[PDB]
Amino acid sequence: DNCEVKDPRHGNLYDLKPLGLNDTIVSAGEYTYYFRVCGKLSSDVCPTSDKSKVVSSCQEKREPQGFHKVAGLLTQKLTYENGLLKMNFTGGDTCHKVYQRSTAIFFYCDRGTQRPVFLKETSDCSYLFEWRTQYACPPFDLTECSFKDGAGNSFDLSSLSRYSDNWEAITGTGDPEHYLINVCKSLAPQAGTEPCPPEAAACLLGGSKPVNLGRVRDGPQWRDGIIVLKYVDGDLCPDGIRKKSTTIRFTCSESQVNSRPMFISAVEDCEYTFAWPTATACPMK
Ligand SMILES: *[C@@H]1O[C@H](CO)[C@@H](O[C@@H]2O[C@H](CO)[C@@H](O[C@@H]3O[C@H](CO[C@H]4O[C@H](CO)[C@@H](O)[C@H](O[C@H]5O[C@H](CO)[C@@H](O)[C@H](O)[C@@H]5O)[C@@H]4O)[C@@H](O)[C@H](O[C@H]4O[C@H](CO)[C@@H](O)[C@H](O)[C@@H]4O)[C@@H]3O)[C@H](O)[C@H]2NC(C)=O)[C@H](O)[C@H]1NC(C)=O
């Protein structure tokens, strides 16, 4: 009800009503999809002589030889299920005799708001869309991610900051553990029932419980001839005095446009080290 749902891990309240100010129109091949977040369609499409139905989503095969199919009825239900924000307009026109068309929007956290995109139609005639929008973001920590070297060259790692997912570090194929990392921000929300601590910018998964390997503090800087980003104040180290920390060493490699951080070392379950050759770490022009 009411186009809102609370995040059970962060406590913030997602409110997608600003996305329902107007009809949303999405082209997908020969189709145009119309839907209204938490409201009735105002567009002159998908007429129904059944008054008890309030149409909120419409699939239009454009002319020539066009047609309209009701793809979902009015709902203000927004669900948050194991880390995923979804809205499902149900009750559309009959499909393959035993189904009814539906329209499902998956909302993902984004730096801004991108136009929604049609993904696929499921075998039960559910039309799946993704919508990347800042409205789907729980709170996160963020630091400046641009910097200079001593010679005045400029650098910016901001494009490695990921809002809807996280970087999975590359370990040996035998490693039963895996590492999630983000850049100049805490981790993006994760699907599942075992999420990392909300304050973590780096996290160790595979043990009994996720482990926070450090929080955002300061941005990246050139130190001793290497670009370094450090996360601090993770979970307590086993010695009981220090808190876990993570160092990411970046190096410029123009060919490395879709690289991932590589796990280098974990010392005393306390200091974690990653190395990341990336075209993003090269001097800007
Ligand atoms: C958005 O929301 C909509 C609405 O919920 C989702 O659409 C539904 O998707 C599910 C798939 O996840 C569909 O389930 C399958 O449905 C088929 C067809 O079921 C119909 O025909 C059957 C054959 O005659 C009949 O038995 C069914 O009757 C049962 O279900 C209805 C409710 O739909 C209920 O009223 C009846 O009393 C019965 O309980 C029905 O008329 C079915 O064949 C599938 O069954 C297989 O799998 C299930 C496990 O999933 C298993 O239990 C079965 O034994 C069988 O192995 C399966 O149930 C569903 O039909 C869709 N609903 C409609 C109205 O089309 C949509 O997916 C959502 N989108 C997103 C992205 O979440």
Curated annotation (Swiss-Prot):
Record-annotated MRH domain positions: 1-139, 143-284
Disulfide bridge map: 3-38, 46-58, 95-125, 109-137, 145-184, 196-203, 237-270, 252-282
Coiled coil residues, start to end: none
Localization in the cell: Golgi apparatus membrane; Endosome membrane
Protein's job: Mediates the transport of phosphorylated lysosomal enzymes from the Golgi complex and the cell surface to lysosomes. Lysosomal enzymes bearing phosphomannosyl residues bind specifically to mannose-6-phosphate receptors in the Golgi apparatus and the resulting receptor-ligand complex is transported to an acidic prelysosomal compartment where the low pH mediates the dissociation of the complex. The receptor is then recycled back to the Golgi for another round of trafficking through its binding to the retromer. This receptor also binds IGF2.
Comment on protein domains: Contains 15 repeating units of approximately 147 AA harboring four disulfide bonds each. The most highly conserved region within the repeat consists of a stretch of 13 AA that contains cysteines at both ends.
Annotated protein name in UniProt: Cation-independent mannose-6-phosphate receptor
Residues represented out of the complete protein: 1225 to 1509 of 2491
